[PDB]
């Protein structure tokens, strides 16, 4: 079976072929391996070879509990073989598929064995079936199963094979995934079956068999963790385990399944569980479950109680994205064309820092959605967002970092994204000026936070088990606690200055959160910085 | 052209493997058209699975026609074999010309061609991408101007003979032509060079003024009435500049604030403090001592957003030593955004850097990674691409370089 051209293959430079010996396993499977190898010899898939290849790869035979399968271990050869263009990893997302009147699934059997292997490379595929006294030598003429080059070379071969058929049939759309072909068309059912038959025979001319019966797979289709119905898609049912104790492995699989659920079931929250997964220690140990994680999990269970589906994609209809706040640090989004019919859903939980605010997270969510949309639909969607032009404009104008804000429309669906507070850009007249400082002995971890004001008020609060940074935040917090609704605060800490000027409404540290509550309760707050250890109102202490 | 220049990679190093970035349907369409035509013209050829290598490609508008830009940064890093005039920056006018098309006249070393492999991506992973490699010298590859160098010398020789005072420097796909001539004369000579290039079969389908380029002097505020907050800002800024300029003193200025005063309190400048401030204004006029360019070290460009369409930048090698500083501005017209201005600024800084040192700086970009990676090709008109990374550095930086 020459007509398929062979891809040239080389070993890695400086490397020879595998000499690894056959491991007996003198068990009766020998004869099995004979029978199979005779059949494959009849079909020209393999060949007996002269006494000097010289090379070897281990061959095995088994039946998992009637048939017998030959399994060759190509690991050593695979390490010694050149890389090939990476075979398809990413799969088409169901939400990106365009609805077709008829869809057929074609599994080609013995896919790899139907494609010839490069002649000069065949000697390296040699294997031995053991004689009882000590054997018969064989080599592959086709792409072996388990070999490094098989998927990419078969992929290429299949593409080239498919070109002439697709050329004369532009109205039918063919997806190629591994061995499978998925063939859609809008043609009448009869002539669709006809076109399928044509494709089948065309493939048969290249030595590729397709399902002979009325094709083995019927709607719906279980494919890569999905259910594909003619009019809709969804995910295969997600079963969340119930345990008293959880290891880090269990939590990884849990957040995995939940992540998988998030693309369709709206409202999924993974954050607190991955917070549990912040421990990287090798995956054995029992990880303590936090109340927040338990709550999160329970809510997820309540969401997964109801059945949910997505729809398929129409290029003529607009692409629309909508975003809602899920509570602390967490967001959820829906992508749809028809208003209540979701193409898909998702989430954004990421802080990407110890502190952030709502608008920043929203903008990041928009970014993630944009990327995903480009990947799946090859275009960016329209955004319906729960934020007002004034809010966002003020934010991105006063934001030091460059940002891209799309065309969007304000939808009013509380909670609305808002600025909980805004620091003053100018010092406040009539407001008390707090000169703050804090310090800690790095050895003893003991510290203090204090202020002196222009009204003549001075205070010092003692602190235990703390650092200079935390004390410098502590001082600011202290000045917030003891002042009126309007306050001027002066600090020598670049750290604290950086944290507050960023205007976070949420944080990992409870100290910063307290500071945020204070800032919200305030009306006017101005933060100013001065260089430390120069003549200044606030002075210094130890 | 039949004789190919053999090209090698630095010992113990393989070809580039780099992820192709997802693209919109439009850009993919454009790339498919372009690559179809290029394949018909023999410039590129389809390749099989036996080629592991990949290089990113993008579609940019540079006219209405789509252009294909290949990002060769990795291949450029991994492949080197083999001058910059110092007078180019002194010239009154410098014009840039795209000579890249010429590279398509020269075939590429066969054994090396596989390292030029690139992929036109598919939407939603419907198909594996369309894979090509280059049969000729690709634009953006640093081997191209090196191999074409003798031809370029041959073509330019008569012109240089005719115009001895005109400077011509080549970087990548670009010719930089400086002159001290009057603008009209300059553009006339430029056009002469253009037609000279065209009639010899070199296709050339942006003028600077490096004479005006300078390192920004630090500017101190001028006020009729000074508050405590103002003098605090002043002292902080002068303290920052004190590292760079040794003579600066804050004592008399800080004396006015000496303790426990309200921020909004108006503080008059005493003649001593005003003396100190004036002296500091005077020392800020002179350039910094001991700042020299090192060709063996990476150039580094930091940018910060000043708002209202203003952006400031610094080019340095080692911290606090500034080879150049500048400020870029754009008239908004309500069309503009942050990404556009940042991209433009990056291109301008890179051009300035090429003109002055003959190399591109490593950029520290005040933007989110994914946002830049998404939108940067929209406004990018340049044939080359700089290295870049992404940082914030807000806290004291905006106010000081403002
Ligand atoms: N197993 C399996 C399997 C089956 C079909 C796939 C596929 O099916 C398609 C193949 C070609 C063209 C359109 C396709 O689907 C569009 C959406 N759709 C999907 C399923 C259905 O019944 N009807 C329908 O209109 C597209 C992509 C992957 C597929 C995997
Ligand atoms: Mg299959
Ligand atoms: Mg301090």
Swiss-Prot record, chain B:
It comes from Human immunodeficiency virus type 1 group M subtype B (isolate BH10). Changing residue 141 to A: 73% loss of DNA-directed DNA polymerase activity. 70% loss of RNA-directed DNA polymerase activity. It comes from the Viruses. Changing residue 273 to L: 68% loss of polymerase activity. 10% loss of RNase H activity. Changing residue 375 to A: Almost complete loss of RT p66/p51 heterodimerization. Complete loss of polymerase activity. Changing residue 174 to N: Loss of pyrophosphorolysis (reverse of the polymerase reaction). No effect on RNase H activity. Changing residue 175 to I: 29% loss of DNA-directed DNA polymerase activity. 46% loss of RNA-directed DNA polymerase activity. Changing residue 141 to Y: 58% loss of DNA-directed DNA polymerase activity. 42% loss of RNA-directed DNA polymerase activity. Changing residue 238 to S: 17% loss of polymerase activity. 30% loss of RNase H activity. This is p51 RT.
């Amino acid at each position: 079976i020459s007509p398929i051209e062979t891809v040239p293959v080389k070993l890695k430079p400086g490397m020879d072929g595998p000499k690894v010996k056959q491991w007996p396993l003198t068990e009766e499977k020998i004869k099995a391996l004979v029978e199979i190898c005779t059949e494959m010899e009849k079909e020209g898939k393999i060949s007996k070879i002269g006494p000097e290849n010289p090379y070897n790869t281990p061959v095995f035979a088994i039946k998992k509990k009637t048939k017998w399968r030959k399994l060759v271990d190509f690991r050593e050869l695979n390490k010694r073989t050149q890389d090939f263009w990476e075979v398809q990893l990413g799969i088409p997302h169901p939400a990106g598929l365009k609805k077709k009147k008829s869809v057929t699934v074609l599994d080609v059997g013995d896919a790899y064995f139907s494609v010839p292997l490069d002649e000069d490379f065949r000697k390296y595929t040699a294997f031995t079936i053991p004689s009882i006294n000590n054997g018969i030598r064989y080599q592959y003429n086709v792409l072996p199963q388990g070999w490094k080059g098989s998927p990419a070379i078969f992929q290429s071969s299949m593409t080239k094979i498919l070109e002439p058929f697709a050329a004369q049939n532009p109205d039918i759309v063919i997806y190629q995934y591994m061995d499978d072909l998925y063939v859609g068309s809008d043609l009448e059912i009869g002539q669709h079956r006809t076109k399928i038959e044509e494709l089948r025979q065309h493939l048969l001319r290249w030595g590729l068999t397709t399902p002979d019966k009325k094709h083995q797979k019927e709607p719906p289709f279980l494919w890569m963790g999905y259910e594909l119905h003619p009019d809709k898609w969804t995910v295969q049912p997600i079963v969340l385990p119930e345990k008293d104790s959880w290891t880090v492995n269990d939590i990884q699989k849990l957040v995995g399944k939940l992540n998988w659920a998030s693309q369709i079931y709206p409202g999924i929250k993974v954050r607190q569980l991955s917070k549990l997964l912040r421990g990287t220690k090798a995956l054995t140990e029992v990880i303590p479950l936090t109340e927040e994680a338990e709550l999160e999990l329970a809510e997820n269970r309540e969401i997964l109680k109801e059945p949910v589906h997505g729809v398929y994609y129409d290029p003529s209809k607009d692409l629309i994205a909508e975003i809602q706040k899920q509570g602390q640090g967490q967001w959820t989004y829906q992508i749809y064309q028809e208003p209540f019919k979701n193409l898909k859903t998702g989430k954004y939980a990421r802080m990407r820092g110890a502190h952030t605010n709502d608008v920043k997270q929203l903008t990041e969510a928009v970014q993630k959605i944009t990327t995903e949309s480009i990947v799946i639909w090859g275009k960016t969607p329209k955004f319906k967002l729960p934020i007002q032009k004034e809010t966002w404009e003020t934010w991105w104008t006063e934001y030091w970092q460059a940002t891209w804000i799309p065309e969007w429309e304000f939808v009013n669906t509380p909670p609305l994204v808002k600025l909980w507070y805004q620091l003053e850009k100018e010092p406040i007249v009539g407001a008390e000026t707090f000169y703050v400082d804090g310090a800690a002995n790095r050895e003893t971890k003991l510290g203090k936070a204090g202020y002196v004001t222009n009204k003549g008020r001075q205070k010092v609060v003692p602190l235990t088990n703390t650092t200079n940074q935390k004390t410098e935040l502590q001082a600011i917090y202290l000045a917030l606690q003891d002042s009126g609704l309007e306050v001027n605060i002066v600090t020598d800490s670049q750290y604290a200055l950086g944290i507050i000027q960023a205007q976070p409404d949420k944080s990992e540290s409870e100290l910063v959160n307290q500071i945020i509550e204070q800032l919200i309760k305030k009306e006017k707050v101005y933060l100013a910085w001065v260089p430390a250890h120069k003549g200044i109102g606030g002075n210094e202490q130890v | 052209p039949i004789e190919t220049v053999p090209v090698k990679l630095k010992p113990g190093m393989d070809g580039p493997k780099v992820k192709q970035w997802p693209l919109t349907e439009e850009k993919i369409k454009a790339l498919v058209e372009i690559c179809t035509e290029m394949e018909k013209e023999g410039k590129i050829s389809k390749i099989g699975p036996e080629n592991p290598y990949n290089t990113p490609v993008f579609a940019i508008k540079k006219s209405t026609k789509w252009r294909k830009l290949v990002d060769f940064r990795e291949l450029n890093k991994r492949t080197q074999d083999f001058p910059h005039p110092a007078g180019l920056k002194k010239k009154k006018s410098v014009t840039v010309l795209d000579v890249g098309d010429a590279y398509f006249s020269v075939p590429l070393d066969e054994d090396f061609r596989k390292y030029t492999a690139f992929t036109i991506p598919s939407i939603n992973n419907e198909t594996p991408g369309i894979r090509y490699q280059y049969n000729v010298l690709p634009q953006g590859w640093k081997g191209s101007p090196a191999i074409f160098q003798s031809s370029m010398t041959k073509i330019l020789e008569p012109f240089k003979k005719q115009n001895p005072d005109i400077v011509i420097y080549q970087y990548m796909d670009d010719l930089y032509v400086g002159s001290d001539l009057e603008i009209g004369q300059h553009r006339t000579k430029i056009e002469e060079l253009r037609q000279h290039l065209l009639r010899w079969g070199l296709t050339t389908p942006y003028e600077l003024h490096p004479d005006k380029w300078t390192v920004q002097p630090i500017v101190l505020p001028e006020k009729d009435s000074w508050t405590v907050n103002d003098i605090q800002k002043l002292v902080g800024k002068l303290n920052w500049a004190s590292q760079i300029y040794p003579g600066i003193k804050v004592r008399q200025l800080s004396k006015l604030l000496r303790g426990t005063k309200a921020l909004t309190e108006v503080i008059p400048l005493t003649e001593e403090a005003e003396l100190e401030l004036a002296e500091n204004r005077e020392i800020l006029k002179e350039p910094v001592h001991g700042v020299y360019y090192d060709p063996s070290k990476d150039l580094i460009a930091e940018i910060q957003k000043q708002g209202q369409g203003q952006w400031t930048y610094q080019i340095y090698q080692e911290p606090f030593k500034n080879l150049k500083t500048g400020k870029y501005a754009r008239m908004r017209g309500a069309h503009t955004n942050d990404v556009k201005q940042l991209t433009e600024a990056v291109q301008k800084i890179t051009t300035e850097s090429i003109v002055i040192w003959g190399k591109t700086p490593k950029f520290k970009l005040p933007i989110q990674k994914e946002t830049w990676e998404t939108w940067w090709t929209e406004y990018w008109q340049a044939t080359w691409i700089p290295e870049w990374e992404f940082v914030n550095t807000p806290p004291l930086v905006k106010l000081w370089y403002q």
